[PDB]
Design a protein around this ligand. Structure first.
Ligand SMILES: *O[C@H]1[C@@H](O)[C@H](n2cnc3c(=O)[nH]c(N)nc32)O[C@@H]1COP(=O)(O)OP(=O)(O)OP(=O)(O)O
Ligand SMILES: C[S@@+](CC[C@H](N)C(=O)[O-])C[C@H]1O[C@@H](n2cnc3c(N)ncnc32)[C@H](O)[C@@H]1O
Lengths: 284, 255, 255, 255, 255
RNA sequence: UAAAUAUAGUUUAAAAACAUCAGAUUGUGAAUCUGACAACAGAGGCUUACGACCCCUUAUUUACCCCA
């Protein structure tokens, strides 16, 4: 394609472009319909390869430092199998959670409104979210709702989880949350909700929108939560935090960590400790 | 050798009971399938051939078990083996402070009735039937095999009712063995672990697969055929009495 | 220390329950005697003084236990300890071939109801009451102590019903301990052997004295006071959980 | 089936080992008799035919067991089953106040060495041999069966050393089962009670006759053939792992 | 009460032994710290005051224990309580197929020697010393308390040697209790779970935090003080004999 | 309306540190190894280049109160 030759002249001009581009990424260069959009894409690949190089250089630096250390160089109760045993322990908790645990829903109905960039970030955030849930003392029973089998978000989840996808102790279904739970016990979380969250309710199912809208579309979570007559709630960020800068729409990982410690009989202060510190200047 | 033995298998229309029936009938035993009328045991009895019959009975009911045992006497003339495989469970926590949920007393009663009281009902009634047998060369009149679970030892969260009922069967194995020892009936208990039974398959697929992986070896769900094999081994072995055998592949249940 | 603890003791009008009440009240605990209305628990409550009250309740009935627990909340404000000492036995053989007598199913049911179903009924209801407590420094909300028997392990002839019920309590100790562990309630089981309880002293002198002599050491019947001591020890030790402690003087019951 | 399996049977020149060898060889297995040089195992090996060989070894000695295992590899090409039947007992009281007689520490050591340390020595060395096997369809490489006793649970007076050694085998069954589970080796323990072995014949005729009578059912000494049957059942059953099976005819040893 | 009792505490210079010594001496008992010469036992004995002395001894050695017991008789005049807390632990897999590593026989021997043979050595020798005591009102001469582990029941991977030794102590508790019952010595076993003993607290903070979280309730490592409390409870309770008490906070060790 | 302001895991800095994910039966520096993910609000421009410079959108904060 002409794009392969196209990038050549951009390389000469030194517009922050990386050394080589994989054929996969060539396809995504065709997607960009603007010079400006191409610029933002090339810069991302430029910084990506730079960090790859720096990490590798720091890697083999460590490897060379480790091998020279080896040259320089009892009654135990336990073998060192802690990482293995922890994974098993977290497994047992996950199975228990799937039977008895409180539901928590991620709504995956937002693929349409997201671009490729935002879609990977959602999956990155989902990965972190499930992790914090896994490692918790009282895990949520995590539901992936409105997840198409052949969808982009499903395809991306499978890639990041590999064989672990099948073995994850969460429920993924193409069905909606209104189909799985009584409609009265569903509280949809969104920053745009007029209703403030006063206390964490253990009888309620909370729905979190799997939506990273860097290109901000306000009210989309609220619109879904109104089309289906669901209750909406927003976090008491205004009440407890001195908001100065930043978006009040938090990331998924932050949301779950706020809920997890709310569920675990914490107060709002302990909960809002996960709210990015750059966004507020203390508790009021 | 189990050729020419009549086994009354409780809950024999599915699960571990059906597996026991299949094996025993294959080895030349006669089987009576004692399950509920709706259990579809008639199809199973028809499948197994002439040497298997279906007796519709609730194990909690004395009248039902008596009628079923009478059917066995009518058809096959005697009873040599009783296998108790009838079982229900509930997954309910004793108390959930968060949700303000207490375990229902009715749930506890219903599980105890079927598992514990049902097993005892069969035992006390089949002991009468087995008592009428003339002793063999070894002085044996019958073998009674009960199914507990590993829940009797390592019960998970929400298994309180199930563990209580299975604990009861483990408890009363030895007393009953000592009771029936004069009249030459052997009482034995099997404690299956994770088997491919309807009880376990009712769990989420992801939870089942995890539980399978947690078995040391082999890392799979217990084949019901393996329970049938152990049943035959107990019947054949004259000197197995008053014991619980854990058939679990060396698994211990974590909470 | 057990100073200022409120103990709900079931079957507290006699036997091991009364012994527990006497000791706990002496050590500065408040006790609720939960026994049947006719058990003469009112006299016992009056004897023990101000820090003991009588709650007439049947342990099998949810309503009765709820009313009794409410009485505890009214009088003392909270519940810290539950001791399950209420229990009956029947001495009936499963089947005796000679005289052709079968264990009656009603007798089996009645023993199960009081021992197993009654214990569980108290547990599930006291867990609610204990749940309402603020955690102490150690995160503990309550201790639940159940009474099984050595019959749970080695039952004598004619103890099938009793062994089943006691087997159930031993079975379900661990599941319930795991259930209530998040809440911070410890579940413990004591398995007494032959104690000088009213039930044993009622038996013929020849039979009692022989059974006493068969205890390795000390060669005597268990003093109920010793049961009370072990109860206090369990309450005081905040690391005893999900275990059955055999208080039998090293006796194993012969067939 | 056990057709074409190679069993290394420890203490195979007499008692429960020989019974196991007889049965396994009859069912078409190849056996290695691992016993002491003087045990007369050569006659037994000659009697059992081509499919049985005698390997003189002391089980406490690593060199001896290695040579014996090498003989098995040479002759039969692999090792599939290990049965640990080798054992000694000493009948000495811990302390006799009347006579001022103390249990000899050497006696305790000698019993531990043969029963516990000998069993472990075989296990750790045969696990190496079994490890070299290609997994079958079920992923199984080998079965290791150990012989404890009912002494492990209810030890008689003067069986402190014997109970300690048998307690050790019961203890370490599960850890070893978990150890070898990745490899695909099943570890199982049988706990015989009162078998008609030469050891028990060595007791007075009056005492043996009494012990036989004290077995609930059947009221006789365990036939070694019954031990062999249970061994075969364990080998055949893919899902028996990390368990102790009491083969005692429902007897509990009184003090 | 434990006022005026002389306790010989084995491994008393650290861990659960020292905790037992601290409590007993505080309650007005006299203690003999029986530990290795190189343990900081002399400083511990000096710290505990006049009612505590240090006896340097190896528990495996008969001569050493005899000299230590003689020191107890010299200083305090008698021996009433023996607490066996001496132990070592080893983490070795039975066989590692990947690395071709076999468990060393010497490792197995040395663990057995200290844990099992050492405990028995103390028991048999203290029983002599306790035998010389005049019986109290209850006919009791002494109490012997042994420390097993939960490894005796659920041993993890690499705990084969440790589980064998702890299994042995659990096994031989009842035989020895029956042995010493005529003399009037009570034998009891405690089976601690995860305690803040030196070998656990040495671990990384992440590993400790995980171990704490594994315990159902309380979600913390066992304080050695809790072990001391249970020791005192056993000494005070006349009717606790021939039993293993699991002090584990309801934990079952996963593979 | 005007101003600053906007780090999608968190900070700091003007790229790192700490985190995340998958694999691992680890002999107790696994205190590791092999991979995955790497986008300073968003869109479009200008320029040799830039996170500067322009513009729009959304959002935050504050000020204003609307043409006082
Ligand atoms: O141009 C501004 C301005 O005239 C007016 N406005 C709104 N808030 C303020 C304020 O605090 N101070 C001043 N001086 N002026 C203010 O609103 C105009 C902007 O309105 P838009 O046309 O952008 O949006 P609109 O209100 O029509 O939006 P919507 O509410 O219908 O969605
Ligand atoms: C970044 S937000 C998505 C923003 C989207 N424009 C919307 O309208 O919600 C991702 C999810 O986190 C949750 N969330 C984030 N901030 C929240 C807040 N302040 N209150 C409640 N829920 C919040 C919501 O469930 C939301 O769908």
């Amino acid at each position: 394609a002409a794009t392969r030759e196209f990038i050549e002249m951009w390389r000469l001009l030194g517009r922050e472009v990386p050394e080589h581009i994989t054929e996969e990424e060539l396809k995504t260069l065709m997607e960009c319909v603007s010079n400006t959009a191409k610029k933002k894409y090339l810069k991302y690949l430029y910084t990506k390869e730079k960090v790859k190089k720096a990490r590798q250089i720091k890697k083999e630096m460590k490897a060379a430092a480790r091998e020279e250390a080896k040259n320089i160089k009892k009654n135990f109760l336990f073998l060192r199998l802690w990482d293995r045993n922890m994974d098993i322990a977290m497994g047992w908790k996950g199975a228990q959670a799937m039977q008895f645990g409180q539901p928590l829903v991620f709504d995956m109905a937002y693929e349409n409104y997201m671009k490729r960039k935002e879609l990977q970030n959602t999956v990155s955030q989902l990965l972190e979210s499930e992790g914090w849930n896994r490692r918790n003392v009282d895990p949520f029973h995590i539901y992936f709702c409105n997840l198409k089998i052949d969808g982009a978000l499903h395809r991306e989840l499978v890639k990041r989880y590999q064989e672990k996808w099948d073995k994850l102790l969460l429920t993924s279904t193409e069905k909606s949350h209104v189909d799985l739970f009584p409609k009265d016990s569903i509280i949809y979380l969104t920053a745009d909700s007029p209703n403030v969250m006063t206390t964490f309710r253990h009888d309620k199912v909370y729905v979190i929108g799997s939506f990273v809208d860097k290109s901000m579309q306000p009210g989309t979570s609220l619109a879904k939560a109104k089309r289906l007559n669901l209750a909406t709630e927003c976090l008491p960020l205004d009440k407890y935090l001195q908001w100065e800068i930043g978006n009040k729409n938090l990331t998924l990982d932050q949301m779950i960590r706020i809920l997890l410690c709310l569920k675990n009989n914490g107060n709002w202060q302990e909960a809002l400790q996960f709210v990015p510190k750059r966004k507020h200047t203390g508790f009021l | 050798s189990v050729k020419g033995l009549v086994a009354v298998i409780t809950g024999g229309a599915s699960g571990l009971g059906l597996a026991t029936a299949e094996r025993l009938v294959g080895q030349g035993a006669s089987a009576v399938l004692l399950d509920l009328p709706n259990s579809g045991g008639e199809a199973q009895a028809k499948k197994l051939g002439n040497n298997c019959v279906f007796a519709p009975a609730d194990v909690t009911s004395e009248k039902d078990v008596q009628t079923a045992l009478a059917l066995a006497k009518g058809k096959f003339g005697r009873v040599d083996v009783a296998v108790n495989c009838a079982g229900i469970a509930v997954a309910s926590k004793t108390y959930n402070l968060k949700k303000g949920q207490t375990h229902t007393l009715e749930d506890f009663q219903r599980v105890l009735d079927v598992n514990l009281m049902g097993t005892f009902n069969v035992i006390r009634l089949v002991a009468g039937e087995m008592g009428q047998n003339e002793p063999d060369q070894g002085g044996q009149r019958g073998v009674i095999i009960n199914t507990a679970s590993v829940a009797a030892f390592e019960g998970q969260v929400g298994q309180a009712a199930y563990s209580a009922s299975k604990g009861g069967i483990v408890g009363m194995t030895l007393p009953i063995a000592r009771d029936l020892a004069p009249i030459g009936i052997r009482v034995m208990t099997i404690a299956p672990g994770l088997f491919g039974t309807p009880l376990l398959t009712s769990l989420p697929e992801k939870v089942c697969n995890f539980l399978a992986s947690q078995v040391p070896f082999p890392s799979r769900l217990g084949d019901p055929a393996e329970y049938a094999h152990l049943v035959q081994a107990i019947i054949e072995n004259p000197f197995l009495n008053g014991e619980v055998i854990r058939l679990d592949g060396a698994i211990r249940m974590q909470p």
